[PDB]
Design a protein around this nucleic acid. Structure first.
Ligand SMILES: Cc1cn([C@H]2C[C@H](O)[C@@H](COP(=O)(O)OP(=O)(O)OP(=O)(O)O)O2)c(=O)[nH]c1=O
Ligand SMILES: [Ca+2]
Ligand SMILES: [Ca+2]
Ligand SMILES: [Ca+2]
Ligand SMILES: [Ca+2]
Ligand SMILES: [Ca+2]
Ligand SMILES: [Ca+2]
Ligand SMILES: [Ca+2]
Ligand SMILES: [Ca+2]
Ligand code: NA
Ligand code: NA
Length: 898
DNA sequence: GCGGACTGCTTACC
């Protein structure tokens, strides 16, 4: 096989590289890397190297890397540009791997681990590591084994060995329900004291040194705790054994510590999740996320965690094993590790650099330029400046019965490729007219020769740009994976349909590739399968869709981040001229097509001057299709699915070609390199046929709800609500309130005013029986100490921060009580006046039951009235007033009758 | 006593 690196580090004049060789075996080499940097040279000096602008450069080979850096410093002191890749690790990877890296992930050692630390006096600070590590479960992806390190003897209690027999048993058997599929993969190692455990773990670590190291909060807790515990007990020299190159770096931010283990790529899964999952969670405990991702139950245990080991060591160890497995399960679904490996090996960077799109792109562009013997520019210092972004239309707050949406494919990257925007493709500038002059095709055509953006920039049309070139490569990967996703999604609905008439028989789920649309044979067979087989296929379909979703939405994130990078001062190719060129072109593009779409629809409908586009954000338009429906009349339709097919055919056969023409014209207007403004229909929304549902509504910018029947070619078996911006979508809104508001919205859009009022009346009556967590608000807890004046709210103290202070005062003096962590999220509850807490609200760590110390008092003093009106009624008022509805039956003259 | 303007903070949408 082809060789591929695992990890790379720069230690002084040495490059330390772990890699897999041609025989598939992991090796480690210390290379005295001789890096090259470049300087401009006279035209007469013959060379093969040029900067991106065509200026010749002479290559300076250096004896070592530290000499190359000192030269950069000198070139600064002289006042001359020092060109080339200054991050020598990247240069090394580029040299050593001069080809598209094909990697075998089975050879890459991925370690999932989690430790347990019993602490009687609150949260065990990793920087201190005062308390013994009494459990470590370490899963090795190569061995496919869970290595369990169990401390039987601790100053906090002596316990018996964990029983794998009891662990396997059902919880109803007094067992721990450790998944049967991993029972045989567990390797249990009890220890009679902490020192022997840690030394054995270190030796274990050396034998099976992690390449990818992950888990939940491993970077903020596990790794630094383990490192500091081993450091405190055995000394710094043995603690460094955690690094295959025996070098670590303690980065301090008081005290807080993030330890850097050279030779290991740490991908904390909480960070992978926060960056790649595109969720915003009320809590980020592994418990909460697992329940959300895997629909598994919360890990139930009786007492407090600080006593769990003493009371139920059996379950303590079992839960530790499960916590490791749950991350693996989440990763099996989300596939963020795979994503990081793909992106990482594609860019030729340290795998952990996937968290930095700038670093990611700097390397991609660098490697692409190195291919053509071209020399990258030196990074420069720039002041941060604001610059304009997208256009968002101000919608008329109202209900909207029939709505079709249209969205541009990969907008900003497409703008980049179309205009050919790149640092080295800048041709010059032109005198700009007001933006609306270009929108209305009134302004003079910017250039006859160059490709233009209405911001004033001109670009060469002939030559290829390294930014368009490399953004196009990644975009193609994105388009491919989105295809698999949508197909999985479409296949999902097919199974959902067949699940309406499940055949009474015993069979097995069909072997199919869900990434591709089911064949007619497959669809025929599906209608004959049982519920068990169908539900299993629906599950695999959804799993395939999620896998496709991760691959596509994150490649989309990467290319959109290339745009964003252009507006970031730390990007080597930062340039507001290009960034604004993109956004301004974007603003034009959207509003140009708004006019075009309006003109076409007035034309084909027969109307004149009517506004068909009711809303738009960046690259989308929402078209009021009431008159398209009415020109045929509701009468001529069999069922709801009929007019959905009608609008589907209409958008596809009539509107899209018109849009294609409208954009193709715009492309000539700007004299762009290549027409890439591809705006396809997205949503088809409307009420059920013959129902009293309103279909949809807008309350303002970025706030709307639609009863969608079809989405990008996916015909749902049951209509799906597309709600944007509204409280139902906000993590800050209580779970039960989201659920209730959503049902309110559903009823408005699908059933009508009478149905809404009915549900509202019922909710108002019964809502006081809702669990306190389900009605608690959520908020991030930033700058608590900023507003902490003697335990009391300082000036301008935010509501939720006030709640935290109230909490701190209530639990003052309990070391065992859970502390609110700065930056993390909290549940927030209003308190009725005269409550013994002394304030109008309270707050506690999210994802947890509030401590038993004060729980019963909080429950008794919750302000349900405030909770209802503030959280439920007020947003519902906004929804209904916008939609011209009432959630309560208004008073009439008819109230004088019986 | 408090509504309106403004600010800080939060979390949405692209
Ligand atoms: C979602 C998102 C969009 N944007 C900008 C750039 C996008 O091109 C533009 C449109 O956003 P989107 O239409 O949401 O995403 P997209 O058009 O780029 O790709 P597609 O629609 O085919 O799935 O908004 C960002 O800069 N960052 C983001 O996270
Ligand atoms: Ca734990
Ligand atoms: Ca059970
Ligand atoms: Ca011993
Ligand atoms: Ca889209
Ligand atoms: Ca888009
Ligand atoms: Ca059937
Ligand atoms: Ca969009
Ligand atoms: Ca099209
Ligand atoms: Na220490
Ligand atoms: Na249906």
């Amino acid at each position: 096989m082809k060789e591929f690196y695992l990890t790379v580090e720069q230690i002084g004049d040495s490059i330390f590289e772990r890699y897999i060789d041609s025989n598939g075996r992991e090796r480690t080499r210390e290379v005295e890397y001789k890096p090259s940097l470049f300087a401009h040279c006279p035209e007469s000096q013959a060379t093969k190297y040029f900067d991106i602008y065509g200026k010749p450069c002479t290559r300076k080979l250096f004896a070592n890397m530290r000499d190359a850096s000192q030269w950069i410093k000198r070139m600064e002191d002289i006042g001359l540009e020092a060109l080339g890749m200054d991050d020598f690790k990247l240069a090394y990877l580029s040299d050593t791997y001069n080809y598209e890296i094909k990697y075998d992930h089975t050879k890459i050692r991925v370690a999932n681990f989690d430790i347990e630390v019993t602490s009687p006096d609150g949260f065990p600070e990793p920087s201190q590591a005062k308390h013994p590590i009494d459990a470590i479960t370490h899963y090795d992806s190569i061995d496919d084994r869970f290595y369990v390190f169990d401390l039987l003897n601790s100053p906090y209690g002596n316990v018996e060995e964990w029983s794998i027999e009891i662990a396997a048993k059902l919880q109803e058997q007094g067992g721990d329900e450790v998944p049967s599929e991993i029972i045989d993969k567990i390797i249990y190692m009890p220890f009679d004291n902490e020192k022997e455990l840690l030394m054995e773990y270190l030796n274990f670590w050396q034998q099976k040194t992690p390449v990818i190291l992950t888990g939940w909060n491993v970077e903020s807790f596990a790794i630094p705790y383990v490192y500091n515990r081993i450091k405190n007990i055995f000394g710094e020299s043995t603690a460094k054994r955690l690094s295959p190159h025996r070098k670590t770096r303690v980065k301090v931010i008081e005290s807080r510590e993030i330890i850097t283990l050279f030779g290991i790529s740490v991908l904390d899964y909480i960070d992978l999740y926060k960056k790649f999952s595109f969720t915003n969670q009320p809590s980020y405990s592994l418990d909460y996320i697992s329940e959300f991702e895997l629909n598994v139950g919360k890990l139930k245990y009786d007492g407090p965690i600080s006593k769990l080991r003493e009371s139920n060591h059996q379950r303590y160890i079992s839960y530790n094993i499960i916590a490791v497995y749950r991350v693996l399960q989440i990763d099996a679904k989300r596939q963020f590790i795979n994503l990081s490996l793909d992106m990482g090996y594609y860019a030729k960077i340290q795998i952990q650099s996937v968290f930095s799109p700038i670093k990611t792109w700097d390397a991609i562009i660098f490697n692409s330029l190195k291919e053509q013997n071209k020399v990258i520019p030196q990074g420069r210092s720039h002041p941060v400046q604001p610059y304009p972004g997208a256009f968002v239309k101000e919608p008329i707050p109202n209900r909207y019965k029939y709505v079709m949406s249209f969205d541009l494919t990969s907008f900003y990257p497409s703008i980049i490729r179309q205009v050919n925007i790149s640092p080295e493709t800048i041709a010059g500038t032109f005198k700009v007219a007001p933006l609306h002059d270009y929108i209305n095709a009134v302004a003079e055509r910017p250039s006859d020769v160059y490709s233009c953006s209405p911001n004033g920039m001109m670009y060469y049309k002939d030559r290829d740009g390294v930014v368009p070139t490399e953004i196009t490569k990644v975009f193609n990967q994105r388009k491919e994976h989105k295809g698999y996703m949508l197909a999985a999604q479409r296949n999902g609905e097919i199974i959902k349909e067949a699940l309406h008439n499940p055949n009474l028989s015993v069979d097995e789920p069909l072997d199919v590739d869900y990434r591709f649309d089911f064949s007619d044979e497959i669809k025929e067979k599906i209608k004959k399968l049982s519920a068990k087989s169908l539900n299993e296929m629906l599950f695999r379909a959804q799993r395939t869709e999620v896998a496709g979703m991760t691959a596509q939405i994150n490649r989309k994130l990467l290319i959109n981040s290339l745009y964003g990078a252009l507006g970031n001062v730390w990007f080597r190719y930062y340039d507001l001229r290009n960034a604004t060129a993109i956004t301004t072109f974007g603003q034009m593009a959207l509003q140009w097509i708004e006019r075009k779409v309006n003109e076409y629809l007035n034309e084909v409908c027969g109307t004149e001057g009517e506004a068909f586009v009711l809303y738009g954000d960046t690259d989308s338009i929402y078209v009021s299709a009431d008159k398209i429906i009415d020109k045929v009349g509701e009468s001529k339709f069999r069922d709801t699915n009929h007019w959905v097919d009608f609008l589907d055919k209409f958008a596809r056969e009539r509107m899209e070609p018109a849009i294609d023409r409208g954009f193709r014209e715009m492309c000539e207007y700007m004299n762009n390199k290549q027409h890439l403004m591809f705006m396809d229909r997205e949503a088809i929304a409307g009420p059920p046929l013959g129902s009293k549902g309103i279909g949809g509504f807008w309350t303002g910018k970025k706030r709307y709800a639609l009863n969608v029947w079809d989405m990008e070619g996916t015909r749902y078996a049951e209509p799906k609500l597309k709600i944007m911006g509204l409280e139902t979508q906000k993590s800050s809104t209580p779970k039960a309130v989201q659920k209730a508001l959503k049902e309110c919205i559903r009823r408005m859009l699908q059933e009508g005013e009478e149905s809404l009022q009915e549900y509202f009346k019922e909710f108002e009556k019964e809502f006081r029986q809702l669990n306190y967590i389900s009605i608690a608000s959520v908020s991030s807890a930033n700058n608590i100490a900023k507003y902490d004046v003697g335990g009391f709210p300082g000036p301008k103290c935010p509501f939720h921060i006030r709640g935290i202070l109230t909490y701190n005062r209530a639990i003052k003096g309990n070391i065992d009580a859970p502390q609110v962590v700065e930056g993390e999220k909290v549940y927030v509850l209003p308190l009725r006046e005269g409550n013994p807490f002394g304030d109008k609200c309270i707050a506690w760590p999210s994802g947890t039951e509030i401590t038993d110390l004060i729980k019963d008092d909080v429950l008794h003093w919750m302000d349900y009235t405030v909770l209802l009106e503030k959280t439920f009624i007020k947003p519902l008022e906004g929804f209904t007033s916008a939609a011209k509805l009432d959630y309560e039956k208004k008073a009439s003259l008819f109230d004088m009758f019986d």
